[PDB]
DNA sequence: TAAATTTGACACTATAATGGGTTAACTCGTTGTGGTAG
DNA sequence: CTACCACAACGAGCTACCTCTCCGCATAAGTGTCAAATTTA
RNA sequence: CGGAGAGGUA
């Protein structure tokens, strides 16, 4: 156990020994970027592969080409939070070494000419942050995975389409990852035709002559051939055995002098097998056998020079006669059966209308561009431009290998462009399928569909950036001057940076971030979206997508996904779930040798799954041995069954691997139904971190990982003995062992304090650790929001009873006691950010100052000088934050202040009020005043002040870093040197500063005593540089939007405490609302007096099916007695050695507990700090699926004394009365929802309205008024309510007199309405009449 | 399916019993939107037509 | 033919390329604005500032007028 | 059916409102027709009472007056 | 032919693809006549 | 019509009447300037795509895109449609003194009666105040009202609980599947920030307490207030209106 | 209003340049053509 | 001559509410007189 | 004060 851990000890139930650990959660999306970043110069991935497959380029003529060198990106002007606070994107400059060689025309080859090479500067990419996150124009933005179809070719069939016939028609698809499509499907009379990117139909026998193929190659490629001889008038055939399968004989199959088959028998396979052990090969026939057959292979006689019968005609007596003849003694025909050899090419070219090559190209001209006239070099073009350019056609080597997979090849590799054997064995697979042998694929399998994440996205959009200005640049190059004209002066960086910038700004991927806590962070990062460009749309889904397949197990999560209309196209990725090279989806498995379970793990596919036999992971092992049963459950080809425990080959590696992250912090999942447990990890990602996080009682042992991998807390790099813990920062000293030479060994971890997040809630860095505290690497130093050394904390356990309360509980609603609210559990703090622009207007620009008109000093005793509230003071609805004041305009001034304007002065009469105020019910401090410029304008005192307070931070907290560091630095000198020789009392008699200078003979020591001497002076130029640089950085204005002079944010920090009308909600999707707020004395209490903090309603368990709810209730009760067992102990102080016994007893417990944990080690301070940390009860680890059963959680209730029923007496706070039942009492971990009533409570009366419909706006952000849909108005009609209707579709809405004249008489006392013509009316009059069609108001 | 789920919702269920019963589970989750589009527009064809 | 072909033509979009109607002088200088900035984003490898568009583009422009110049 | 009834109703701005506006504009426009407004529907749609419950009086009032003169 | 067909840059191209190119000399004529 | 950042955000219709009257002005040129047939011919057509393409986009061929890559809004489009002017603007309506809350239970009510929260009251009722301050003589100007009830005295207080006694309010929740869905309700001045619902009610709004919402009307007029006192009171729909049985039924 | 001046409009460039970019390609019922075969 | 089928095209898809971000994107050659509407005293 | 895209609640 690390330093980290043995603070609090969580006891675990689990019994299944863990062999592989949590990987890094956040590993797809790094791994993506690293692969884009990183150069790769033979695994070409990203930036490399992007430039390699555009560059070169040549001219139209070629005496001009673009080679490419190298790349290299640029460091970044600003850091992650100047980005942030700036509003600007965190990118890198790229920068290409490109070289331009000139070509001679005069000679044959002058490649040698001009060579002209430098750093042409394209497009600024942006960089990913340690946390898997991209920062653009100061929000945090992520870049979600897409689960879309994989390149290659799918054989697919429709079940039955065509209701009158019921046959199934089978269809192939041809997927490239860029370029066209291409379609071969079968009609009710079965033939093949070919669709070309979904467009209309032609005979597939159009691209076989295309691809300059004729009738008798065709009828050789696919029908083999049948030998027909002709020999003084009599027939025979050369017959192979195995084609007289399931037909009837129609003729006497006989022999040379034996008779086999009579009249009216089918030819049965034991005939057919005596026919293989008689062995004969030559059978006669009678003459009608031909009629129905058809030749293969045209015959010309040599004589008179013309085609009796051309090649796929149905022959028949007379031509029979004529061939005879004509002299042509061999006839080769095509085989044909019904059942495995059917006539489906023949029959096709039979509809087809094409003779030769140039008829199909004109024939595919007329499809892809109707109504043109075609040319022969136009067609000739676009076919081998449709299939076989590559840069109009293109399987990405991912195709290719699900190609030649699909096809029954041998190679992964290949061309990436189509070819003619492809087509060939694609066409010759479905005619295969048609005929019965082979299998349709399944889209849902988890084999055909890829995962692309954020690399290959933005390398494709990089890409079509190049391939932009490379088009652009071809086109110039080849007219303009060619000496004079440098590389870089030709490429536009425009159109590569449009490119990345729309793609990491407005696409359907790259969205918002949602971190309200770490886990919402996590569980969006591992997110895989079915949509997006080249993906589904929520129409193009129906039920076979949503749908859970038995190849996501592992691999997807299958009870993570949002409840609404996206219930099965947003899935979350699983917790061992890595990813393949190409991007498919692969699990971990540990392989089992003859009977043993070993060690070793092997990463698998979904095609690879259904090959082997699976154990499940809840199978029992002897020793990490062999199985103990005989007969193991077991799952193979997507099916689960009983096998032997000798034909298994795998084992699940843990009991976890089958869910997500979200849903494996749900203790006791295994008894919740599916419903709640999707709606309980659904909810636990909406939790607002309170003020103070607490650690629930019953865990999962994943809140550690999840806290640790989410980057939220501050994780040590390299263990050492901290040196100095501060509110703001944490100073640590290195080992020895873990310290380079180079440097002093001493870092430095800042923490962030109270930035506002994306959902307006905030984010704290709190210190965990201690002065002069040993840490290691790897352990947690400051807890985040949600963290509590070092585990994820989302809310507060509480005490709880299941009985109904006088009706406060009917409907999911929830009773709460007064202690939640004194002790604030449940009070957050949001902050809350206002924006105020002066923008200038074209008479004047917007001032901000304290000379505001119509307001007295009541409203400015906030507002200091320069008209901006001072830091700190608090403020209420209402009240003015910035005095921004504007220019009216002529049109707003009347003539009595246009006399006094040229008479008393300008600043008279020429401005109106328009300060940024509180939105009403906000209230709350204000922390921070930022005050951005325009360059060029002088600002205000304000912002100077702000400037040198900026100023002085930077130089003084920077100042510190050297202080601190310098200090590390000479102690390290002063250890080294008394490493060296013997030197203490002179060195503290001389100045500290002054500990280099000293030395003697010089040998290796010496030489990192000089080392660290360089690196001094190194650090003290570093901190110069670094210091003017910052100094230059703020001291310089920022660059805003046209038209802006200057712009003041303010950051006001509310305070929320819970209210009737806040949701909360448990982790088994118990979710509820407040319903009343009860005093402590009115609390159901228990013999010793405690009161039940709040009372749910048991009626919920029962038609829900989540008892997750009341096993967890029973296992925080037993931890709580155990925990105040402890706290009674250390309150009497009775000793170290009970305390040490209780709690090794308590830990103990467990049947068959995987972990071990012995006190023994621990120290008396530790065992005192522990015992000190468990007071509040004993954190409980309850794996899923794997968890505690109800005999353990019985022996711990015993253990703590209480009743092992769960169910305890309590008495009426109200009355004393003791209740009939036992009532089942206990600690449950309750969250709070960012569902808050403050946020969703809005009334208006009478505001702004529309311009063109002329009613009231929508939306409490703008004020507007609730909509009155059609639902509603039909109800009112069937209640038969006139007036009602009609108030609420003229004087309440869009119509202008009746609303003033409502107004008018109201507040007269009047109750009376005057109603007119709705304007929306008039709207439609006027839009139908700019139609054309006359419409009128007929008067009678 | 063959196998039914024998266990029940106190017992606690294994993996696989969990993973079949979600294909219910979201084949019912889904049918509820489904055919409340289905019934409003029913409803609102029914209504206009009397 | 050519000289004439190509002055109708971007005449043309001197006048309906826009909502607004914008006057040809004012679009040759947008155009005598825009070559600028990508000569001097190509040159210096970051976008131009006003004043520095000032001190290269013309004798009587200065830091307001294109200012206005800029829709 | 429900849907052929609803588009075959006498009054032209109820079928507009529910289904199919062009072709039933179109419709109406050629064939010269005129609206009365009987439906609750259209009274809903002009800004009047609808004529049921308490406003049907009225209605019939208002028709009792346009007969009678 | 002149069928199907609705984008109206085909078809103005379609019948200004019937006419032919002019030599060095056929301008002359032609100028010569005007 | 300008933004708030200087630029304008116009109708798609003024791009479609720039478009014809472009291709207009530019035929009425071409056929005073004696061009030949065929650039004649060219110029009417696109001015009857330009014409028919103004009627409605994305009926003839190819819908007309504008500058975001999307097909043009028509006039067409702006009468029929699920967004057009009939189904959004004249059949359902945004309505004024309209608020909207989140619910909780109340168990002390009775079948006639909704805990109203104060705040709602105060700004769903502020013209009545006004008049009420007004007749009263606390006030002279409608302003002075206007700043009195802005900074909420204890007599605006006492005058609003004279306002709203038997001044019954709508309570309506969406989806209003059958008429059950808006009922009224005598209001009653409850300190908070949810609307007390009465429990018996909650089987015929189909209501749960797990974070539902619902908003609130305001009749006016006289025949308003009579139609929602004997017409539309919890008290008087009883039995359901689908087959003769109670839906106020213990749940 | 007389006068200034930056805007606004229109007319004119004389080597030879000779056919364009492109997107994405469920389920169901009703209506209208377009043959089809005897 | 006309009873019949298979394709193409068109119109349809609950309700209400809340939050956030985006919308003149890669492309373009300058001079020269004449009128004229906004600008100083 | 508009329109699109993404997400969330009932
Ligand atoms: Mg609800």
Redesign the interface.
């Known amino acids: 156990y690390s330093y980290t851990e043995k603070k609090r000890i969580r006891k675990d139930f689990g019994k299944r020994p863990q062999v592989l650990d949590v990987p890094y959660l956040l590993s797809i999306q790094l791994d993506s970027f690293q692969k884009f970043i990183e150069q790769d110069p033979e695994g070409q991935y990203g930036l490399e592969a992007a430039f390699r497959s555009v560059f070169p380029i040549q001219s139209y003529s070629g005496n001009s080409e673009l080679q490419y060198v190298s790349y290299r990106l640029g460091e970044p002007v600003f850091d992650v939070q100047e980005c942030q606070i700036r509003g600007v994107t965190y990118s890198a400059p790229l920068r290409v070494k490109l070289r331009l060689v000139i070509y001679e025309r005069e000679a044959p080859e002058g490649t040698v000419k001009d060579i002209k090479e430098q750093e042409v500067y394209m497009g600024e990419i942006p960089l990913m942050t340690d946390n898997g996150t991209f920062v653009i124009n100061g929000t945090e933005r992520v870049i979600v995975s897409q689960l879309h179809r994989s390149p290659g070719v799918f054989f697919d069939s429709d079940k039955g389409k065509t209701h009158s016939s019921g046959k199934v028609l089978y269809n192939a698809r041809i997927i490239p990852y860029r370029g066209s499509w291409l379609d071969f499907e079968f009609d009710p009379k079965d033939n093949l035709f070919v669709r070309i990117d979904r467009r209309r139909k032609l005979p597939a026998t159009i691209i076989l002559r295309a691809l300059n193929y004729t009738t008798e190659q065709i009828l050789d490629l696919f029908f083999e051939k049948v030998i027909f001889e002709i020999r003084d008038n009599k027939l025979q055939m050369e017959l192979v055995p195995e084609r007289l399968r399931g037909e009837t004989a129609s003729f006497d199959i006989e022999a040379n002098g034996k008779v086999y088959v009579e009249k009216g028998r089918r030819i049965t396979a034991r005939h057919i097998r005596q026919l293989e052990k008689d062995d004969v090969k030559l059978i006669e026939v009678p003459v009608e056998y031909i009629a129905g057959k058809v030749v293969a292979k045209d015959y010309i006689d040599e004589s008179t020079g013309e085609l009796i019968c051309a090649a796929n005609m149905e022959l028949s007596l007379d031509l029979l006669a004529k061939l005879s003849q004509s002299g042509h003694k061999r006839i080769e025909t095509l085989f044909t059966n019904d059942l495995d050899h059917g006539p489906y090419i023949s029959e096709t070219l039979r509809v087809d209308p094409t003779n030769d090559r140039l008829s199909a190209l004109v024939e595919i001209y007329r499809m892809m561009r109707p109504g043109e006239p075609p040319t022969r070099e136009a067609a000739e073009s676009l076919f081998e431009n449709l299939f076989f350019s590559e840069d109009r056609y293109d399987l990405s080597a991912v195709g290719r290998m699900k190609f030649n997979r699909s096809l029954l090849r041998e190679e992964i590799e290949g061309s990436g462009i189509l070819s003619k054997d492809d087509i060939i064995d694609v066409m010759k697979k479905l005619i295969d399928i048609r005929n019965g042998k082979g299998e349709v694929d399944d889209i849902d399998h988890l084999g055909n569909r890829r995962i692309r994440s954020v690399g290959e996205m933005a390398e494709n959009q990089f890409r079509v950036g190049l391939v932009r200005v490379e088009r652009a640049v071809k086109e110039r190059l080849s007219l303009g001057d060619l000496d004079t004209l440098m590389p870089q002066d030709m490429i536009n960086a425009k159109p590569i940076s449009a490119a990345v910038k729309e793609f990491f700004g407005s696409s359907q991927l790259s969205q918002f971030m949602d971190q309200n806590n770490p886990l919402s962070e996590i569980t969006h990062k591992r997110r895989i979206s079915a949509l997006g460009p080249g993906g589904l749309t929520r129409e193009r889904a129906g039920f076979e997508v949503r749908d859970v397949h038995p190849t996501h197990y592992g691999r997807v999560c299958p009870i993570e996904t949002p409840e609404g209309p996206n219930i099965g196209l947003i899935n979350s990725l699983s917790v061992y779930a890595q990813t393949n090279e190409y991007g498919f989806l692969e699990t971990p498995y540990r392989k089992v040798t003859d009977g043993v379970v070993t060690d070793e793990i092997h990463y698998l596919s979904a095609i690879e799954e259904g090959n082997y036999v699976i154990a499940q992971a809840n199978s029992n092992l002897d020793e990490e041995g062999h199985f103990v049963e005989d007969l193991v459950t077991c799952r193979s080809k997507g099916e689960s069954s009983l096998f032997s425990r000798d034909q298994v080959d795998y084992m699940d590696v843990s009991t976890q691997q089958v869910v997500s992250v979200g849903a494996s912090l749900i203790p006791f999942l295994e008894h919740d139904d599916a419903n709640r447990a999707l709606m309980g990890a659904n909810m636990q990602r909406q939790a607002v971190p309170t003020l103070r996080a607490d650690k629930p009682l019953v865990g999962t042992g994943m809140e550690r990982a999840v806290a640790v991998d989410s980057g939220v807390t501050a994780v040590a790099k390299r263990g050492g003995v901290v040196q100095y813990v501060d509110a703001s920062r944490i100073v640590i000293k290195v080992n020895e062992d873990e310290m380079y030479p180079g440097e002093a060994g001493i870092d430095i971890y800042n923490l962030t304090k109270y930035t506002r997040s994306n959902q307006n809630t905030c984010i704290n860095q709190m210190p965990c650790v201690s002065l002069g505290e040993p840490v290691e690497r790897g352990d947690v130093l400051a807890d985040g929001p949600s963290t509590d050394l070092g585990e994820l904390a989302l809310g507060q356990n509480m005490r709880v009873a299941f009985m109904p309360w006088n009706g406060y509980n009917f409907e999911d609603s929830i009773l709460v006691s007064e202690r939640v609210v004194q002790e604030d559990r449940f009070t957050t703090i949001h902050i809350q950010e206002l924006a105020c622009v002066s923008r200038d207007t074209k008479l004047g620009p917007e001032e901000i100052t304290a000379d505001i008109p119509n307001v007295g000093e009541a409203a400015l005793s906030k507002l200091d000088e320069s008209g901006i509230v001072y830091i700190g003071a608090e403020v209420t609805g209402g009240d003015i934050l910035v005095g921004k004041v504007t220019p009216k305009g002529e049109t707003q001034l009347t003539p009595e202040e246009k006399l006094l304007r040229a008479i008393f002065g300008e600043k008279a009469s020429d401005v109106k009020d328009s300060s940024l105020r509180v939105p009403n019910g906000v209230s709350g401090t204000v922390i921070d005043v930022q005050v951005f410029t325009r360059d060029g304008v002088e600002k205000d005192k304000r912002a100077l002040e702000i400037e040198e307070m900026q100023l002085k931070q930077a130089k003084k907290d920077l100042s510190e870093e050297l202080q601190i560091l310098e200090a590390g630095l000479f102690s390290r000198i002063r250890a080294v040197l008394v490493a060296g020789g013997v030197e203490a009392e002179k060195l503290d008699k001389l100045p500290r500063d002054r500990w280099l200078e000293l030395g003697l003979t010089d040998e290796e020591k010496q030489n990192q005593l000089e080392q660290l001497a360089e690196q001094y002076d190194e650090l003290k130029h570093e901190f110069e540089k670094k210091l003017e640089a910052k100094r230059r950085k703020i001291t310089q204005g920022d660059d805003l939007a046209p038209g802006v002079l200057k712009i003041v944010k303010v950051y006001l920090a509310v305070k929320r405490r819970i209210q009737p009308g806040d949701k909360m909600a448990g982790r088994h999707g118990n979710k509820g609302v407040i319903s009343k707020i009860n005093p402590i004395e009115d609390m159901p209490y228990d013999e010793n007096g405690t009161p039940v903090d709040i009372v749910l309603n048991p009626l919920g368990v029962p038609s829900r099916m989540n008892i997750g709810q009341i096993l967890e209730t029973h296992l925080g009760m037993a931890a709580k007695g155990i925990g105040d067992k402890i706290n009674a102990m250390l309150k009497q102080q009775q000793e170290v050695a009970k305390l040490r016994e209780f709690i090794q007893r308590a830990y103990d417990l467990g049947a068959d507990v995987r972990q071990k944990v012995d006190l023994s080690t621990f120290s008396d301070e530790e065992v005192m700090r522990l015992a000190e940390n468990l007071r509040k009860g004993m954190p409980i680890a309850t794996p899923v699926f794997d968890g505690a059963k109800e005999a353990e959680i019985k022996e711990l209730l015993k253990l703590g004394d209480l009743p092992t029923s769960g169910q305890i007496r309590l008495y009426d706070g109200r009355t004393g009365e003791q209740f009939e039942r036992p009532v089942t009492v206990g600690y449950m971990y309750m969250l709070k929802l960012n569902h808050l009533v403050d946020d969703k409570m809005h009334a208006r009366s009478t505001g702004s309205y529309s311009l063109v419909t002329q009613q009231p706006l929508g939306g409490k952000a703008q004020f507007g008024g609730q909509r009155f849909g059609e639902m509603e108005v039909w109800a009112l009609e069937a209640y038969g309510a006139a007036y009602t209707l009609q108030e609420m579709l003229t004087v309440k809405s869009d119509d202008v007199n009746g609303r003033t004249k409502m107004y008018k008489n109201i507040v007269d006392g009047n109750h009376q309405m005057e109603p007119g013509m709705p304007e929306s009316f008039n709207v439609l009059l006027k839009e139908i009449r700019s139609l054309g069609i006359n419409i009128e108001l007929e008067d009678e | 399916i063959e196998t039914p789920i024998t266990a029940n919702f106190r017992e606690g269920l294994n993996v696989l019993q969990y993973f079949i019963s979600t294909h219910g589970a979201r084949k019912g989750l889904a049918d509820t939107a489904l055919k409340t589009a289905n019934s409003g527009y029913l409803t609102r064809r029914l209504v206009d037509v009397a | 033919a050519t000289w004439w072909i190509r002055q109708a033509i971007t005449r043309s979009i001197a006048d309906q390329a826009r909502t607004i109607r914008i006057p040809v002088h004012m679009i040759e200088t947008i155009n005598k604005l825009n070559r600028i900035s990508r000569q001097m984003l190509q040159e210096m490898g970051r976008e131009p500032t006003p004043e520095e568009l000032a001190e290269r583009m013309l004798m009587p422009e200065d830091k307001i007028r294109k200012v206005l110049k800029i829709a | 059916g429900?849907?052929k009834?609803?588009l075959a109703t006498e009054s032209f701005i109820?079928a507009?409102?529910?289904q199919?506006?062009?072709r039933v504009?179109?419709e109406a426009?050629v064939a010269g027709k005129?609206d009365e407004l009987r439906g609750?529907?259209e009274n809903?749609?002009?800004?009047?009472?609808?004529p049921?419950?308490?406003?049907?009086a009225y209605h019939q009032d208002r028709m009792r007056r346009?007969a009678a003169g | 032919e002149i069928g199907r067909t609705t984008d109206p840059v085909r078809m103005y191209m379609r019948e200004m693809g019937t006419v032919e190119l002019l030599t060095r000399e056929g301008e002359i004529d032609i100028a010569k006549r005007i | 019509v300008p933004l708030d950042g200087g630029r304008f955000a116009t109708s798609d219709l003024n791009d479609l009447y720039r478009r014809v009257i472009n291709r207009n002005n530019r035929l009425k040129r071409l056929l005073d300037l004696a061009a030949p047939d065929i650039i004649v011919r060219n110029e009417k057509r696109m001015l009857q795509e330009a014409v028919d393409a103004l009627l409605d986009n994305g009926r003839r061929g190819r819908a007309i895109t504008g500058s975001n890559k999307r097909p043009l809004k028509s006039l067409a489009d702006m009468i029929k449609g699920k967004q057009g002017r009939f189904r959004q603007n004249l059949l359902g309506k945004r309505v004024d003194y309209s608020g909207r809350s989140v619910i909780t239970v109340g168990p002390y009510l009775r079948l006639h009666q909704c805990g109203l929260p104060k705040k709602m009251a105060l700004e769903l009722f502020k013209p009545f105040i006004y008049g009420k301050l007004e007749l009263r003589g606390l006030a002279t100007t409608i302003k002075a009202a206007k700043k009195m009830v802005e900074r909420e005295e204890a007599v605006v207080w006492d005058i609003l609980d004279e306002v709203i006694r038997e001044h019954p309010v709508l309570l309506n929740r969406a989806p209003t599947l059958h008429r059950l869905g808006i009922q009224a309700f005598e209001p009653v001045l409850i300190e908070g920030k949810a609307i007390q619902l009465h429990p018996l009610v909650c089987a015929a709004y189909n209501a749960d307490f797990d974070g539902d919402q619902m908003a609130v009307h305001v009749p006016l007029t006289l025949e308003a207030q009579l139609e929602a006192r004997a017409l539309m009171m919890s008290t008087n729909n009883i039995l359901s209106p689908a087959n003769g049985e109670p839906i106020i039924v213990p749940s």
């Open positions: 429900i849907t009834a609803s109820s507009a409102s529910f199919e506006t062009t504009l179109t426009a005129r609750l529907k809903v749609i002009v800004g009047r009472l609808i049921a419950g308490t406003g049907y346009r």
